[PDB]
Amino acid sequence: AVVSTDEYVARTNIYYHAGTSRLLAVGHPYFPIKKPNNNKILVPKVSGLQYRVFRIHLPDPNKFGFPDTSFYNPDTQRLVWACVGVEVGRGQPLGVGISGHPLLNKLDDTENASAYAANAGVDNRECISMDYKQTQLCLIGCKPPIGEHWGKGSPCTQVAVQPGDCPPLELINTVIQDGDMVDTGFGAMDFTTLQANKSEVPLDICTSICKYPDYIKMVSEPYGDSLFFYLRREQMFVRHLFNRAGTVGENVPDDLYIKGSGSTANLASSNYFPTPSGSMVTSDAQIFNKPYWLQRAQGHNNGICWGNQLFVTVVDTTRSTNMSLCAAISTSETTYKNTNFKEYLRHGEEYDLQFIFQLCKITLTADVMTYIHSMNSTILEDWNEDPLKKYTFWEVNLKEKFSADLDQFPLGRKFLLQLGL
Amino acid sequence: AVVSTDEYVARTNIYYHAGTSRLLAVGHPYFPIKKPNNNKILVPKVSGLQYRVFRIHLPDPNKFGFPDTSFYNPDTQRLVWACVGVEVGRGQPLGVGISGHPLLNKLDDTENASAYAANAGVDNRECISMDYKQTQLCLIGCKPPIGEHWGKGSPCTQVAVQPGDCPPLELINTVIQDGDMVDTGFGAMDFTTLQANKSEVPLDICTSICKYPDYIKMVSEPYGDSLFFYLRREQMFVRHLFNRAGTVGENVPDDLYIKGSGSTANLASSNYFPTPSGSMVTSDAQIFNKPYWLQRAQGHNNGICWGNQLFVTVVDTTRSTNMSLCAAISTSETTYKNTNFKEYLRHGEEYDLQFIFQLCKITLTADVMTYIHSMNSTILEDWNEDPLKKYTFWEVNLKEKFSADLDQFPLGRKFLLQLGL
Amino acid sequence: AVVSTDEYVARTNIYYHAGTSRLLAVGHPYFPIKKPNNNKILVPKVSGLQYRVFRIHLPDPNKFGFPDTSFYNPDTQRLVWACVGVEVGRGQPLGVGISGHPLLNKLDDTENASAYAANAGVDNRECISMDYKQTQLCLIGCKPPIGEHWGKGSPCTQVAVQPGDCPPLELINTVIQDGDMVDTGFGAMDFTTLQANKSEVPLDICTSICKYPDYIKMVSEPYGDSLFFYLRREQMFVRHLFNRAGTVGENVPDDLYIKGSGSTANLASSNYFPTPSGSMVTSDAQIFNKPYWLQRAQGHNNGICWGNQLFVTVVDTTRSTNMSLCAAISTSETTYKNTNFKEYLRHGEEYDLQFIFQLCKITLTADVMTYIHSMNSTILEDWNEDPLKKYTFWEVNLKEKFSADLDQFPLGRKFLLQLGL
Amino acid sequence: AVVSTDEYVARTNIYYHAGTSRLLAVGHPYFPIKKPNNNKILVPKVSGLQYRVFRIHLPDPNKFGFPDTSFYNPDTQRLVWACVGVEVGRGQPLGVGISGHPLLNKLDDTENASAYAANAGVDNRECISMDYKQTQLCLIGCKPPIGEHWGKGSPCTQVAVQPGDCPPLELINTVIQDGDMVDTGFGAMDFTTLQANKSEVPLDICTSICKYPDYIKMVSEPYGDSLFFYLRREQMFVRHLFNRAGTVGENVPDDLYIKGSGSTANLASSNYFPTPSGSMVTSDAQIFNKPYWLQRAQGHNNGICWGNQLFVTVVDTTRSTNMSLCAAISTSETTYKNTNFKEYLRHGEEYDLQFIFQLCKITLTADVMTYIHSMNSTILEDWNEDPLKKYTFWEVNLKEKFSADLDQFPLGRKFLLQLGL
């Protein structure tokens, strides 16, 4: 049976504040800029539509050097940091980005037509952009976040997949890594392996995987380490209604309509797809720049940072403004020439993480050691190499950032005022 | 006279949690894919616009094996499960679908015209799509849900129906089955028997019946078993205003206008129809992924699951995203060809039901047996074959899912915390 | 001086529930279908834009047969029913209708023009539709509801009305009858007598009178019998901005502009008119399917149903969906032909009225008789033919619907729970 | 360690009211009007999109002449004004402005296209306007406000910047000055040094720097003098989706798409940019003409106006209406001629600042003098020239505006009523 950490984890009266200076990220909104002949990344892809997964490293409270150490017995017990307050600071002005594709698979406008559309020739793709669905979310736990997305399932060993045959779907659980893309209105799926077309969606998700947090699975999790607190806010509406060029993968059963004739003789593509639009962004609706007090967790792990680790996943598309900056090739002629200016695109993201940690002690009794051992053997082994080296996240080191004077920091003042004593 | 179940049903102190693992549904959004020559369904129709009716099967508390059985007398009484908490988990990202028809009966745009429209020739149908009206609803009871819709009434034995004559209407009460369609903006009616046209609405409801919960009837129900709790949220607005091609079934009385001339000599179709649009979808407006505490029912049946059955009807169009996936017929040519890619459409739905049940006991006195007998004789007969075999619903078996440790589940934790003791 | 009914009307402890089974109305949305040669109505006009005025008939409490009659003295006093609770149940799914005119007087689009519009020829009318303004209202009283609308006032005996002269206006108070039309965005006026054109507004109000409840007058009413409770909710916005064809009735004073030339030599019609639009409809904004507890009236008549009558006026345009149903003239050809199909329009309305009545007694003293006599002499005359035979309303007979077991009805349970004892 | 001012600053019982008469600003909305040959500003640039930074000068409480001076010892202590109440009065009607550029770099409309756009020739710029993003904000502190914006960072000494190379970005902290521009939907950047084009954004920000308050930095500030209170409200949505003419600065990696052919042979600009739009403006959402009670500051400086200074930064775009006024060159001809009228643009801003100040005393002990000295040596030096002469701001002198009769002023009455005693 699993039990609340309040059972075996003791709460001391010591509290420390810790915070990143001010994280900054600048890059291209749709794709990374690199050397053609090479593969080294010159400029990274930085978009408001990516997940930001912070791997927070905390100083081992056992190796730490406290002024006083009488508050516990280093023989019978051990120390763990407990996250009690978080403030995800965001810093650019609110605004909305925009993404498109120079060759988006968009046949005709199906929202309203005055006459039957022409006939699909060869490549009817259009240069089209859209404003993705708005999403604000924040996940916190001591394990990395887990997402879900549809990918190409493995086929059954029977009917040889005829080329062009529709690929099988399969919900795939994955670890959400820093830089991954968020569903933008086309759902959470792997567009690379599910759209040979390479033109169904804008460039920035075009050959990526849009993942959605698997909130159900994470909360079902027995120990609840992956996430002990979260805030989600997503909205979207249909801006345009389009058609997809290409060839009928699956024909429309003729029991659903009466055959046409002349122009209506041939059925137009009924493979419709809408254009998303996350409406207006607003201050009143902000999730960030507000402190979160993680006092009572819904899971059994009440904010204990086992492994002196801490994960903070964020997605904020309310500051997705991309800025175009163009340089002149020549500063002479007083006559505009499109050829005289090189146009570019850049997007900047500004973060500032702040936390309030509470020191905790665990008397290592038999039962306790059996439990903690079953839960996660590494806990004890590490007490008196990186298991997720495969995955990548924004590494954040706070070992030198802890301070006992909450007084001296904004999140700290807030905390004292909130908790009174 | 009918009486509250609180009268004859005794509440014990035992509570169990039960839940589906994670239900998943994948198929085509508009129609089922099957073998042409055949009739066997290869891929089912799965849309966010269908009703999901779950037939929940509970283990018979009387046959059940409790650790202690002193809490009641198996001679004078019997046991029944009482639903006290429900959590309808939903799992895909929020989003809006879209449905159309390659040959929708849409003459001209009547929202604004600069000159009198041409003249209806033969087949002026257009390939048109739309975003259906938004609907969120959840019905819970121990009897299947009942809907209403307009269908073709039986004609009066007199005036021989001339071909093309307008068919008579009749509100028809029906059992809402799993897979049925929800009103999408064209009202709740049987389009197959009321529109020979087969082109008045998008493919997905085109030859179906859109039903609406008959809330009035169900609440009027004397015992109130069909539904002892519900949540409804629907919104819709007019996106476009169109005209219907075809021939005047009923002419406009000339006392309503002044005859035209030249172009305006001939009256244009005044058989207008609007295009629906369920606006933006939002988190703040979510109905699911929130626990429902069925403590005081408005009906006389206060959540007693007679027959160890339980019905959970759901409709959620806030995750109706359809994903288009296309496969290349050839992976050679570096030049796009619509001919080289087969386009398809698929829609996925993710559910996760969770419940908290309270054991109850009934002392089988005379009066009680008389009442329960009148109410539903099968109750007693079953105590110490399926009556709805005709209908189809998502069968859910929970006989092996009950657990006494609410502690170990998310809905369970929520429940304890909520009910304190 | 007038006095509250609380003064002379005594409240007993007896309560009865009464309700219509389920009222249903089906017809054509814009006009009634009848035999051309004849005048008998074959199909009635049923639109979500009409007022529904219910004339509720109650069993005379004096003639009524109560199990116990000791609660009052049939010699010194009399009995009257007092309305204490109402539930206006609505039953179709939420949705928006749409109305137009094949020959609407709409010259050009004045919302935005790139060049000066051509020139009005003969009949520039267009086939145009619109979504009326949204309106939800409910009026309750023991006297029929009173409305206001602008009509053609009587001319002053002087200057002979030159043909085409603008007709004089006059606010006209009228009795709101069942079937009347509600202001739809063009205000409350008599379009028949104020618009010879017969093409200024859609067909459904085109030759009717759109009336608006005269709330001011009704509340000023001394005894306040016409309405002792009401709920109103109306919203509207400008969808399009148009011009009216026709000839200048009143010229634009030239001190308001500088003469043009060439094309701008001739002034375009500045007789603008906007197209209304009641935005989105929503559950959260529903007024019905909620009980109304008429405990404290703002008028002196506190819900006393003098004459054993009761009026319930309703307007609900949140379920104005019109459904087009078309029948094929031939079931052969597999090729669509507009002509093979007769298109029609039908609209259905579903109601369910429920009430909770409280028996009351009046000791017929001198003063009381003088007062009641002045107020409405018929009261006393009827105690120990229809005065509104001229008007027509949905007649509702409840004489056989009263029940002392509130327990057995939904509105009843609600009432008990609400009033505790 | 830093400490709350409540520690060393004593609060007296004296309160004074002070207010500007009514500030007024009139000028051209987009740029300043000046003599061509000259450089002297004839008409200034006044727009609702500029920051308004007020440098409030207060009379030295030490030099001040109070009726009674027994409340403190001028030998052991000193006096400082503490801001306790502020009312930023605004006076024009609510309304929205609009800004454009006669030669905006806008290739084609990428929101929806029916055929592949032509080909960029030379100068495809269009005359385009837009309604900027709505912003309401108010910053108060005893130090000038600090902003952030992206500018051209210094290059690394290596790869010689090829002409036209994309310039490096760098977040630059600056002092926000009166007249500076607010992010308008294109983010906070220096368009002059980052856009050689000179046509990427409307004229009014075209060669300016749009700055955003660096809230993060200011609140992190140890003493918290820069801002001890603030209110921010910003909203924005995408109105249009466009393309940028010019030449590819960075090419689209070919692994993101399938080469086209014929028309789609050449990739269209995928340098998209959206047109902002701060929606509707409303009274209910007003931030001004409301009093702000600065009682508990989140910073350590609790509203103490060291240096007898006070900074009030404001941005209000809810009254950005620009008014066009044109004068006729000739008052003769009765025929309109565009050449006869000179069209102009002017915008007016109306302010009215009001404050309530509380007298405070500081006993100059050793420790106190050490602290205050470290914090800001000038404090003590000034006690018993301008350090920001380089910056500019709306200078406001209140030395002759203090009044002890709060009673006689609107903010004063409000204060008394609010604080009771």
Side-chain angles (χ1 to χ4, degrees), chain D residues 246-280:
Chain D
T247 61
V248 186
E250 278 158 349
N251 267 109
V252 182
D254 41 15
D255 63 292
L256 297 187
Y257 73 103
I258 295 163
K259 215 60 256 257
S261 68
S263 52
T264 60
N266 295 302
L267 250 43
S269 162
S270 51
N271 273 171
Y272 316 98
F273 82 93
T275 288
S277 173
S279 197
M280 178 168 69

Side-chain angles (χ1 to χ4, degrees), chain B residues 2 110 112-113 115-116 123 133 148 150 164 166 194-196 200 234 236 238 247 250 255 258 264 272, chain C residues 91-92 94 101-102 106 109 123 125-126 129 198 239 281 283 324-326 338 341 343-344 346 350 408:
Chain B
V2 177
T110 71
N112 179 358
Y116 219 65
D123 205 331
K133 111 170 183 179
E148 55 168 38
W150 296 94
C166 182
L194 258 21
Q195 305 185 328
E200 306 283 284
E234 50 191 291
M236 175 253 259
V238 176
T247 60
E250 278 158 349
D255 62 294
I258 295 163
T264 62
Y272 316 99
Chain C
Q92 291 292 297
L94 264 53
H101 195 316
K106 174 268 176 173
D109 195 322
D123 200 335
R125 304 180 298 187
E126 320 285 333
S129 58
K198 248 173 187 177
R239 163 91 76 148
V281 280
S283 311
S324 61
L325 44 162
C326 90
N338 298 109
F341 310 93
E343 293 286 322
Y344 305 75
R346 286 288 131 77
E350 187 182 325
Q408 303 309 83

